[PDB]
DNA sequence: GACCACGGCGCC
DNA sequence: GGCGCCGTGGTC
């Protein structure tokens, strides 16, 4: 089809490119091509050829930009058909799916990926041209956001490696203590990491009562909720829970992270995936830095490993009760809006209620526990479920969920309106028009339909929170450039920045105001902001 | 070696 | 409700 022409391509060409591996910060650039005007240009030597580009324009453009930045080239990402397709329908998450759906095949040759990007973009641009609000999201949010994300990915975050190695040894010894005891109590050794072998010991050998079954294969479950409930039944249970906590943290964070330090940067480099969720949230992978531990004491020691560069500080910014505020705006509920206009704190109140203590008797772990309840109920957990969580009697767990929606009456009407409109149009949308298609709203099996309903009415809330954060990042990022600060991480409703010591305070201020004023709702948005040498200390 | 489903669980 | 990653038990 396309005519072969010598590198370099004309300006505005679409790029195709092949990596030795998926992570742009670790990949070798194996091949690079560009397509325009019925021509394909194949770069004789990919790395040198990178220099001739003014923009990365095509499928997965941000990945190439990150690699370009890694090599010291300011090559910003531009148009990316993935972003167009993701906006049309957030189930469009892979180039293979998007290719197949919108006019090509995702292959392993850079020239074909180049030609593909050009074709897909033409086709998707057509599909998105009529959709004014999706077009605004692309232009004002997703396209610029992709540039911000490239810089974040290429920058990475410093990690205290020596600290984590030493931590590992401490935790290994405690783990051996726990497994030794568990084996003594079981009467014999087994693979304590195997939930199948654990199930036999707990339920066949020790004769403990099985409480629940696993979803797919119907095994007797050994999950934390099951064990939690058997705490009093046998002393092996508590020891297992402790074993589970430590091994989770050692296997997921303490051991892998030090091995992932980039040799050029001396830092850790996540990937921020922009077309990965049903709701418009970002995701993070390879490594995932959006689930760094924070709840338990050992989790906090791990979070402490994320530190500022020498002479710099971390600045951590976290939206306050973000999705409950979004809900207030979307529902128009006067009581809920009133709560936020009065500067109240719903998690502290629930926490006060939960633990039965003064408003001023709530600490960061009571409050945190109060989050599960508020978001749990709002997004439709059943009274029975809440009984088990507290754990308080039914009807007491049922009375909380009734007084919860009686205090906030328009929330229900918004939920019912959203669902009705979802059945009719086949999708729900955020405040800015981001869509999620939810076809099962009309399923004839109740539990499928009702799962679909929960996904459907959650998406405008979670997704709008996500729109706001992305737009905040887009506005904030060029202000930071000017001040010499760096944006390092996004964690859904939180940003972590790195700033020179002497500028940290002005940077915290600036970021807080940009985030709070990103898009005035019927309620104020508030941001908690902390500064410190490590991530744990920067909160807040 | 790579990949898979699963159970399980870390965060928002 | 939304994610991504772990080890096990597998297959290939
Ligand atoms: C166990 C469980 C189950 C569901 C959820 C759900 S759905 N979220 C959703 C709702 C949150 O708004 C948003 C940001 O989370 P954050 O922890 O910052 O909460 P916040 O309300 O902003 O409080 P803050 O004032 O910052 O302390 O993510 C969070 C945790 C969670 C945990
Ligand atoms: C753009 C720009 C630049 C600088 C500033 C500075 S310096 N301030 C300082 C001056 C006053 O001492 C104080 C009053 O504000 P408020 O009562 O809100 O306190 P807060 O810290 O904002 O708490 P909050 O999170 O809002 O609850 O904040 C405020 C806004 C501002 C905006
Ligand atoms: Mg928050
Ligand atoms: Mg947060
Ligand atoms: Mg203020
Ligand atoms: Mg404040
Ligand atoms: Mg799974």
Q: Are residues A138 and A183 in the same domain?
A: no
Report the distance separating Cα A366 and Cα A347, nearest Å. 9
CATH code, domain with A218: 1.20.1060.10
Q: Are residues A296 and A375 in the same domain?
A: no
Return the DSSP state at A57.
-
Q: How far does residue A211's CA lie from ligand 2's centre (Å)? A: 52
- Which residue's CA lies closest to nucleotide C6 at its C1' atom? A252
CATH code, domain with A360: 1.10.150.20
Half-sphere exposure of A142 (CA within 13 A, CB side): 28
What does chain A come to in residues? 540
Report the distance separating Cα A184 and Cα A178, nearest Å. 10
Nearest to A198 by CA among A247, A163, A139: A247
Angstrom distance, A303 CA to C8 C1':
28
Give the residue from A465, A495, A528 where a domain finishes.
Answer: A465
- Which residue's CA lies closest to nucleotide B5 at its C1' atom? A216
* DSSP 3-state of A305: coil
Count other Cβ atoms within 10 Å, centred on residue A249: 19
Is the Cβ atom of A454 under 6 angstroms away from ligand 1?
no
Q: Are residues A285 and A425 in the same domain?
A: no
Q: What is the DSSP string of A174-240?
A: HHHHHHHHHHHHHTS---TT-HHHHHIIIIIIS-PPP--B-TTT-PBP--HHHHHHTTTT-HHHHHH
Q: How far does residue A492's CA lie from ligand 1's centre (Å)? A: 9
Give the residue from A114, A136, A154 where a domain finishes.
Answer: A154
CATH code, domain with A127: 3.30.420.10
Q: Name residue A157's beta-bridge partners.
A: A268
CA–C1' nearest nucleotide, residue A196? C8
**Ligand number, closest to the Cα atom of A216:** 7
Q: Are residues A4 and A127 in the same domain?
A: yes
Q: What angle do CA A477, A150, A461 make, to 5 degrees?
A: 65
Resolution in A: 2.1
Radius of gyration of chain A (CA): 25
Which of the nucleotides in strand B have any atom less than 7 Å away from a protein CB atom? 5-12
Q: Are residues A260 and A366 in the same domain?
A: no
Count other Cβ atoms within 10 Å, centred on residue A251: 12
Angstrom distance, A396 CA to B2 C1':
51
Collect all residues with Cβ–Cβ distance below 8 Å to A18 and sequence separation of at least 6: A29, A30, A31, A32, A108, A109, A110, A113
Structure tokens at A166: 């030493």
Nearest to A264 by CA among A403, A101, A71, A431: A71
DSSP strands (E only) in A89-182: 158-159
Q: Are residues A459 and A359 in the same domain?
A: yes
Return the DSSP state at A38.
T
CA–C1' nearest nucleotide, residue A197? C8
Tracing tokens 């030090």 back to the chain, one arrives at A258
Structurally, chain A folds into a number of domains equal to: 4
- Do the Cβ atoms of A155 and A488 come closer than 8 Å? yes
Which of the nucleotides in strand C have any atom less than 7 Å away from a protein CB atom? 1-9
Report the distance separating Cα A247 and Cα A179, nearest Å. 11
Report the distance separating Cα A304 and Cα A532, nearest Å. 10
Angstrom distance, A166 CA to B12 C1':
29
The domain in which residue A28 lies consists of: 1-154
Report the distance separating Cα A453 and Cα A467, nearest Å. 21
- Do the Cβ atoms of A456 and A418 come closer than 8 Å? yes
CATH code, domain with A500: 3.30.70.370
* Burial environment of residue A189 by CB neighbours within 10 A (0 to 12, 13 to 18, 19 or more): exposed
Report the distance separating Cα A540 and Cα A358, nearest Å. 22
Q: Are residues A113 and A148 in the same domain?
A: yes
Residue whose CA lies nearest to ligand 2 atom number 29 = A509
Q: Are residues A72 and A17 in the same domain?
A: yes
Q: Name residue A529's beta-bridge partners.
A: A317
Q: Are residues A289 and A374 in the same domain?
A: no
Q: Are residues A28 and A139 in the same domain?
A: yes
* DSSP 3-state of A95: helix
Q: Are residues A390 and A299 in the same domain?
A: no
Q: How far does residue A55's CA lie from ligand 3's centre (Å)? A: 35
Give the residue from A154, A178, A200 where a domain finishes.
Answer: A154
Q: Are residues A455 and A477 in the same domain?
A: no
């Amino acid at each position: 089809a396309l005519e072969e022409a010598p590198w370099p391509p004309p300006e505005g060409a679409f790029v195709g490119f092949v990596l030795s591996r998926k992570e742009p910060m670790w990949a070798d650039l194996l091949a690079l091509a560009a397509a325009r005007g019925g021509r394909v240009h194949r770069a004789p030597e990919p790395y040198k050829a990178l220099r001739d580009l003014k923009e990365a324009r095509g499928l997965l453009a941000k990945d190439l930009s990150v690699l370009a930045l890694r090599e010291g080239l300011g090559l910003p990402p531009g148009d990316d058909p993935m972003l167009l397709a993701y906006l049309l329908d957030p189930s469009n998450t892979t180039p293979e799916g998007v290719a197949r759906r919108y006019g090509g095949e995702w292959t392993e040759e850079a020239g074909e990926r180049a030609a593909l990007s050009e074709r897909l973009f033409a086709n998707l641009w057509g599909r998105l041209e009529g959709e004014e609000r999706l077009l605004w999201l692309y232009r004002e949010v997703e396209r610029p956001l992709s540039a911000v994300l490239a810089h974040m990915e290429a920058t990475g975050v410093r990690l205290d490696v020596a600290y984590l190695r030493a931590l590992s040894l401490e935790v290994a010894e405690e783990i051996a203590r726990l497994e030794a005891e568990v084996f003594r109590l079981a009467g014999h050794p087994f693979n304590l990491n195997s939930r199948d072998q654990l199930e036999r010991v707990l339920f066949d050998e020790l004769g403990l009562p099985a409480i629940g079954k696993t979803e797919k294969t119907g095994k007797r479950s050994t999950s934390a909720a099951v064990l939690e409930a058997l705490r009093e039944a046998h002393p092996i249970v508590e020891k297992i829970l402790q074993y589970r906590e430590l091994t989770k943290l050692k296997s997921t964070y303490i051991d892998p992270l030090p091995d992932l330090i980039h040799p050029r940067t001396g830092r850790l480099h996540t990937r921020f995936n922009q077309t990965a969720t049903a709701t418009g949230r970002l995701s993070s992978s390879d490594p995932n830095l959006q689930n760094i531990p924070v709840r338990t004491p050992l989790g906090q020691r791990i979070r402490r490993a994320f530190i500022a560069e020498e002479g710099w500080l971390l600045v951590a910014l976290d939206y306050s009760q973000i999705e409950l505020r979004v809900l207030a705006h979307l529902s128009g509920d006067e009581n809920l809006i009133r709560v936020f206009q009065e500067g109240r704190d719903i998690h502290t109140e629930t926490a006060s209620w939960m633990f039965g203590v003064p408003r001023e008797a709530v600490d960061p772990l009571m409050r945190r526990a109060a989050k599960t309840i508020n978001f749990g109920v709002l997004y439709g957990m059943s009274a029975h479920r809440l009984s088990q969580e507290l754990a308080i009697p039914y009807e007491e767990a049922q009375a909380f969920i009734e007084r919860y929606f009686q205090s906030f009456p328009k929330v229900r009407a918004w939920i019912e309106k959203t669902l009705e409109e979802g059945r009719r149009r086949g999708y729900v949308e955020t405040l800015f028009g981001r869509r999620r298609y939810v076809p099962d709203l009309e399923a004839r099996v109740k539990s499928v339909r009702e799962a679909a309903e929960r996904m459907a009415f959650n998406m405008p809330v979670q997704g709008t929170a996500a729109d706001l954060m992305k737009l905040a990042m887009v506005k904030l990022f060029p202000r930071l450039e000017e001040m010499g600060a760096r944006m390092l991480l996004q964690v859904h409703d939180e940003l972590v920045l790195e700033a020179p010591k002497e500028r940290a305070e002005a940077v915290a201020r600036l970021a807080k105001e940009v985030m709070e004023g990103v898009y005035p709702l019927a309620v104020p948005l508030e941001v908690e902001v902390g500064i410190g040498e490590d991530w744990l200390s920067a909160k807040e």
